[PDB]
Amino acid sequence: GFPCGESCVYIPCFTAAIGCSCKSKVCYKN
């Protein structure tokens, strides 16, 4: 629920393969 410092508007969260989750086209981790 807290932004990783990445986005996924156009390009998914590379950090989503770790612990982030694209959420509202921003990467939110928990």
Reading the block at residue 21, the tokens are: 């989750």
Which contacts qualify for 2-10: CB closer than 8 Å, 24 or more apart? 2/28, 2/29, 2/30, 3/27, 3/28, 3/29, 4/28, 4/29
Report d(CA 9, CA 17) in Å as an integer. Answer: 16
Specify the DSSP element, H or E, that contains 27. Answer: strand 26-29
Helix (H, G, I), strand (E, B) or coil at 15: helix
Please check whether residue 13 is in contact with residue 3, taking contact to mean a CB–CB distance below 8 angstroms.
Answer: no
Under DSSP, is residue 16 helix (H, G, I), strand (E, B) or coil?
helix
**Cα angle at 20 between 23 and 3, to 5 degrees?**
60
The one-character DSSP state at 11 is S
Q: In this structure, are residues 13 and 7 in contact, taking their beta carbons and an 8 Å threshold?
A: yes
DSSP percent split of the chain into helix, strand, coil, nearest 5:
15, 45, 45
